[PDB]
RNA sequence: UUUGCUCCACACAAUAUAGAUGGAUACGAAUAAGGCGUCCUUGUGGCGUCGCUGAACCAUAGCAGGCUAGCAACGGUGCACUUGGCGGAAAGGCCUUGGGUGCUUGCUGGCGAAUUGCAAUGUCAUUUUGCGUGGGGAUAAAUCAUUUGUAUACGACUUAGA
RNA sequence: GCAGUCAAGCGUUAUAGCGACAUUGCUUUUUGAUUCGAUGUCGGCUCUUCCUAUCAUACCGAAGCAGAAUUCGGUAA
RNA sequence: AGAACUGGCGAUGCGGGAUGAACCGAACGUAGAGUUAAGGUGCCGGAAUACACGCUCAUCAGACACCACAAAAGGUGUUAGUUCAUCUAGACAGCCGGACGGUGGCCAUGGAAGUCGGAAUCCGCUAAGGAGUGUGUAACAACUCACCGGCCGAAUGAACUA
RNA sequence: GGCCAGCAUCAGUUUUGGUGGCAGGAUAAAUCCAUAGGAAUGUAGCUUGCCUCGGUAAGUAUUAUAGCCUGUG
């Protein structure tokens, strides 16, 4: 006895199972013979809605995500594996977030629009912040002082205890409205972010950094080789 | 008791124009031949349509074990009776016999699950040949390589009532 | 002095090549080795150069020394004799207060009644001259 | 399950040297000593180098290798206080009645003082522990700060305060009133 | 082999000990007990203090002057452990108790004199590491002992004067054993030893 | 702290007999009821074992022995 | 209440009953830790060593222990005095000074033992409310009866009286 | 209580037979309206103690518990 | 409860079960020696605080008659098993990210956008994402989990039995 | 010769030690020796990674500068 109970959830989707992994595993394969360029494209922290967006733009292509290792799997991870001739560069060149993107476009168009695609995006933990941020004094407004505070709905009282405790910001409720004695400076311009000042930042709904497609190399079918890209690899 | 390894070996009593029975054999741990013979009938009527009083002994023989002193281990099958019927049991003993690993069985029983000698049935006793396939904790965690433990504690028996000197418990 | 420092308390290990003293039973006063360990509480020993059968003994039936040597797991008898004599056990035990202490009680007891009476007398004439050295400091 | 040996790691920082003997730890390091009495539970200790302590238990039970865990995380703690410290800010609040809290001296014993809780004419007193510091906050509103090298005695101090002002036979959904702890942290900020 | 055996009481389980000193008394051997203080019981405080409770609880109802009397003192708690496993309403049990005495602490002429223990009562021998115990003291002192810091503050005197002649005593035998090392190569220390002493 | 009465174990000679004939009447009832009642009245090898292989192989050429040890 | 009462030495005398017959031989604390020795920078320090039972240690030879002759050494030990210190938990014991008087088996000798008859506890240890010798020390109360009433069924209690 | 329903189990290779938790019907129908045979032992006064299965007093927990009052519950004789 | 048969007891002491009409052993002249039955061997109390393998900690355990309380019910006590599943194309936990589009689906409501209600409960794009598991708003917002992925790196989960 | 004992040599019953010669089993199995294979809780050696001047981390190597297991005699 003297275990930890799993909470049990009566909820409508069930889990994965070997069969999905499968299933991508033969997509890859399939994928391979059929088109001619493979390009590995990393995608971390990646809204849906921009993901979709480029897979639109991208009509008649391939874009497949999925376990990085099951990617690596069905390229080949080493040399007497390898679905096909010199892949095993490409599989482990591979890493986090890998998307396969395969396709018959010209090289050169591939890369203008991925050196010309940005998107705005949520700031994340440790990176570069965007802008310095400091809520103002009295009334702590939706936007927090970003637009006009009489345009800006205050905000809501059941954020309060969020703000508290997990912000770790001081507040008060009077009649209702979340309230501070003084401003409060979360985020310096050209400083290390953590985790409990995205969350500020994204709360406050603030979006000044930039997602930008980051492209590790490809490999050409009949060449045979995998050529470095190099782009957004900053 | 001490448990010996027997071989019991018997048949039907032969009939007339039916000569030459099947002979069948059984190993049985027991602490004597009688207590021997005893559970091979039972066993053979269990199992065959065999009764003690159709039936004869035709050689009883112990059963040495080929290595004593080299230490093995052991997987032991064993089947018990109960309410709900007949239920398997595997267990795993590190042990340099086949009759001590069953003494120890049988004690692990008496102390466990409660059962008796009559009510535990010896299936199978086979040497664990390759390491690779002992599956149970309490065995796997004395086949570690250079394997070493203090013994803490240590507690010495005095033959006088009273003792002059404070003992110690140290090794 | 700024290093941490802890206590080791050091114990007399179970492992192979452990040399232990049979107690009681067929063998008692003897030595052998740990060829290998079979669980808690048993463990395998071999006694070649004294006599002592290689079996398997219960951990309480013998006690731990101090002396340890190279054996493999498992040696053979042997072995086991091979490797004492190059290890030369017996006299690094033999050199012990431990052992000497057992042979002055075997001798103590295989006095008679006239080297008892000798005893008194040596142990008088060693009593004057140590009571006189000692009176001066 | 019996196991033969189970074993923790307890990592020391450069600053801070350890001395264990017959299970009374001693832990020195930049902000003072600590000492610890750890001899209700049967744990060997041992020191491989000067950056790394082991902690074992020969032949124990679920009991015996749950209370080895406890003594490594008790000892981390003991290490975290000489190092960093402990530091917890706590809030008091009120409706009507504002709360004054005072530090004062009973005999030099550094007892803090709590009047008008809810209007009423008796005065708490809760004594302050040895080597833990109460400052008034700067620059926040009725902010407490208790310091210190000892966790067991910031926190223990820290609840102290908190239940001396229990609200009594009233809907405390209704009477908000209390001495609560707002944060839990580290002396040093280094980073 | 002594006329007299005195126990140390220190460490020692009160059943097992009342047992062996119950067998020495009738086989007629004369016992004295000290530092009964410091006896131990096996299991839980609260469960020790529960058992006595229970022992207060008896008492005759019509007259409790003449019910069980509830002695609080370690040193009675002890003899009544003993009283119980010794048949006392005979001649032979009376004579056997009366080779018994019990105190707190070690009064005079004990604190001089040798005290032994029993391996067979020992705590630490009998008792697994790691169950709980209690002690006497703190029991009596529950229940009702009054003479708990006054047992303690002579036992520290009594320590400090047995540290001082411990002190002497040590400084003499290593003056002793210095004077006998030195004689150690002689004929007649060559000849003790041959014939094992 | 005030301590309840505790119940006796002290064993009742006239409790122990009764236990006994309630026993006897209730051992009796059970076979009476066994008798009358109306009710329709192998666990193989378990998965721990190592060589299971092995006795499925043995079983299997057993039985493929024995169908044709019978016929022929 | 025919010199009563009490201790101090010494003669005669008896006396030693829950069980003598070499010695109850003193650190404290811990036990998943300690004891002892030694060194330093004195500490939760370094090095060495010990346990694995007191199966020890100390005492232990002499007509139940006699009478004498030496050698070596200046030690050991008994008794009666004597110097000083300590001990109040029920101390009533622990240590120490100085002579005296014996003994000494540390070593070498000389005389004696017997017949208790082949064993028979074969009697061996402090205290003595007994007397005899004697040198010194000190010369009371309680109860009954009378009486008071702070007391009281009667005893008891509380007062007073040369 | 009787009659029934369901099915976590038990049973079986013959969807036979048992069967926890639940649930339906009758007793008992909607607008807070308007005493029926103890067949053989009862109650006081004085005075003591015990139990807890707690009415009050002490301390707690919960509830649309604002306050006041109250309800349910825990330790407690 | 009614039949058939057979035992024990009355007329009978003895050992044991603490104590006893039917329980265990055993039937009886007076004694000695030896060995046992049943029951026992910490002490009372004659006899191992024997040896060996495991289990158990009870805020009144247990040392019991094998019946009842008892629903083989409840328990995040502990030990051993059985049958199924997941797993280096990555196990259980944890942290972080995603968690989309038609769409604020239809009716109803003063308001109701996945989350007061009543019925459909689809399609696309996916690694995956419910016409939504809960907190929240007057409605939205926000968080969450269902599910997927990144870091971590080796076993783990569920249902039963004793 | 009455009473109480001690020792010796025997007899009957019984209890408790030491030591000798035989017989059976797989004519014990083992240990030991010889011989032929095999692996790891991989011994020597070799490689590379980079570690307190070579102690290690991981590949190879089946006796080598340790050993072990099985079959047969
Ligand atoms: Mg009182
Ligand atoms: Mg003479
Ligand atoms: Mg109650
Ligand atoms: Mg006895
Ligand atoms: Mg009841
Ligand atoms: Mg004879």
């Known amino acids: ?234 | ?171 | ?137 | 399950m019996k196991y033969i040996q189970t074993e923790q790691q307890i990592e020391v920082p450069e600053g801070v040297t350890v001395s264990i003997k017959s299970r009374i730890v001693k832990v020195v390091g930049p902000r003072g000593t600590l000492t610890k009495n750890l001899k209700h539970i049967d744990v060997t200790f041992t020191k491989v180098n000067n950056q790394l302590i082991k902690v074992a238990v020969h032949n124990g039970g679920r009991k015996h290798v749950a209370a080895l865990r406890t003594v490594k995380s008790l000892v981390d703690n003991m290490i975290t206080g000489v190092t960093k410290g402990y530091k917890y800010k706590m809030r008091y609040v009120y409706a009507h009645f504002p709360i004054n809290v005072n530090i004062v001296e009973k005999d030099g014993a550094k007892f803090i003082e709590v009047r008008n809780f809810l209007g009423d004419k008796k005065i708490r007193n809760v004594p302050v522990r040895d080597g833990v510091t109460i400052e008034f906050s700067t620059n926040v509103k009725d902010e407490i700060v208790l310091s210190g090298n000892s966790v067991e005695d910031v926190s223990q101090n820290a609840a102290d305060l908190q239940q001396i002002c229990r609200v009594r036979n009233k809907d405390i959904r209704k009477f908000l009133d209390g001495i609560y702890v707002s944060h839990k942290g580290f002396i040093t900020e280094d980073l | 082999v002594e006329p007299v055996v005195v126990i140390d009481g220190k460490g020692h389980l009160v059943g097992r000990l009342a047992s062996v000193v119950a067998k020495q008394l009738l086989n007629g051997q004369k016992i004295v007990v000290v530092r009964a203080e410091e006896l131990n019981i096996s299991g839980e405080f609260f469960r020790n203090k529960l058992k006595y409770h229970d022992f207060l609880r008896k008492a005759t109802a019509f007259n409790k002057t003449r019910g069980p009397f509830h002695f609080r003192a370690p040193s009675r708690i002890f003899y009544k452990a003993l009283r119980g496993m010794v048949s006392h309403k005979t001649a032979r049990g009376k004579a056997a108790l009366e080779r018994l005495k019990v105190f707190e602490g070690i009064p005079p002429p004990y604190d001089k004199k040798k005290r032994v223990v029993v391996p067979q009562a020992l705590r630490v021998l009998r008792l697994k590491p790691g169950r709980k115990y209690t002690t006497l003291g703190k029991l009596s002192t529950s229940v009702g002992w009054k003479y708990e810091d006054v047992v303690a503050k002579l036992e520290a005197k009594r320590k400090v004067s047995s540290a001082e002649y411990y002190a002497k005593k040590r400084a003499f035998t290593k003056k002793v054993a210095s004077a006998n090392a030195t004689a150690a190569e002689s004929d007649v220390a060559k000849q003790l030893a041959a014939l094992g002493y | 702290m005030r301590v309840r009465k505790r119940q006796s174990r002290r064993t009742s000679t006239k409790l122990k007999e009764g236990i006994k004939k309630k026993a006897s009447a209730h051992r009796k009832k059970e076979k009476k009821m066994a008798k009358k009642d109306v009710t329709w009245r192998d666990p193989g090898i378990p998965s721990n074992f190592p060589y299971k292989a092995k006795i499925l192989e043995e079983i299997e050429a057993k039985k493929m022995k024995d169908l044709e040890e019978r016929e022929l």
Not at chain 1, 19 to 26: G, L, P, T, V
Not at chain 2, 112 to 129: C, P, T, W, Y
Not at chain 3, 95 to 112: G, V
């Open chain 1, 1 to 234: 006895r003297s275990k930890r109970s799993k909470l049990v959830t009566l909820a409508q989707t069930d889990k994965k199972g070997r069969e999905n992994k499968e299933r991508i595993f033969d997509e890859v394969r399939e994928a391979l013979d059929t088109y001619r360029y493979v390009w590995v494209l990393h995608l971390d922290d990646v809204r849906t809605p921009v993901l979709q967006e480029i897979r639109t733009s991208w009509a008649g292509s391939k874009l497949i995500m999925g376990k990085r290792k099951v990617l690596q799997k069905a390229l080949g991870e080493k040399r007497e594996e390898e679905y096909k001739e010199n892949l095993y560069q490409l599989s482990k060149l591979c890493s986090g977030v890998t998307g396969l993107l395969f396709t018959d476009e010209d090289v050169n168009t591939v890369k203008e629009y991925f050196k010309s695609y940005v998107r705005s995006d949520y700031s994340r933990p440790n990176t570069k912040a965007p802008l310095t941020f400091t809520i103002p004094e009295g009334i702590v407004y939706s936007r927090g002082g970003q637009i006009p505070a009489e345009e800006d709905v205050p905000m809501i009282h059941s954020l309060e205890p969020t703000m508290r405790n997990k912000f770790e910001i001081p507040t008060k409720i009077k009649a209702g409205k979340i309230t501070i004695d003084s401003p409060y400076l979360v985020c310096t311009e050209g400083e290390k972010l953590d985790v409990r000042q995205a969350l500020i930042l994204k709360q406050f709904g603030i979006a000044a950094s930039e997602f930008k497609v980051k492209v590790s190399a490809y490999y050409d079918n009949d060449s045979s080789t995998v050529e470095s890209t190099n782009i957004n690899m900053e």
């Open chain 3, 1 to 137: 002095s700024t290093d941490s420092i802890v206590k080791a308390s050091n114990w007399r290990l179970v492992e192979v090549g452990r040399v232990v003293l049979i107690k009681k039973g067929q063998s008692a006063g003897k030595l052998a080795a740990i060829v290998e360990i079979i669980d808690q509480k048993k463990v395998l020993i071999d006694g070649p150069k004294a006599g002592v059968p290689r079996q398997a003994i219960n951990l309480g039936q013998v006690v731990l020394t101090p002396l340890t040597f190279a054996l493999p797991r498992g040696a053979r008898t042997a072995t086991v004799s091979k490797k004492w004599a190059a290890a030369a056990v017996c006299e690094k035990w033999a050199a012990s207060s431990w052992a000497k202490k057992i042979a002055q009680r075997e001798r103590r007891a295989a006095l008679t009644d006239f080297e008892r009476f000798q005893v008194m007398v040596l142990r008088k004439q060693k009593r004057y001259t140590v009571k006189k050295a000692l009176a001066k400091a």
């Open chain 2, 1 to 171: 008791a001490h448990f010996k390894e027997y071989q019991v070996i018997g048949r039907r009593l032969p009939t007339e124009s039916v000569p030459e029975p099947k002979l069948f054999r059984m190993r049985i741990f027991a602490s004597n031949e009688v207590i021997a013979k005893s559970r091979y009938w039972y066993f053979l009527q269990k199992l065959h349509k065999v009764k003690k009083a159709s039936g004869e002994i035709v050689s009883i023989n112990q059963i040495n074990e080929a290595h004593p002193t080299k230490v093995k281990n052991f997987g032991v099958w064993v089947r018990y009776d109960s309410r709900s019927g007949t239920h398997n049991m595997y267990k795993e003993i590190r042990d340099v016999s086949r009759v001590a690993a069953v003494e120890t069985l049988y004690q692990d029983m008496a102390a466990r699950h409660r059962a008796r000698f009559r009510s535990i049935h010896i299936l199978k006793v086979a040497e664990i040949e390759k390491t690779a396939d002992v599956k149970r904790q309490y065995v796997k965690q004395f086949l570690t390589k250079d394997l070493k433990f203090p013994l803490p504690h240590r507690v010495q028996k005095s033959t006088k009532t009273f003792s002059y000197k404070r003992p110690s418990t140290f090794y």
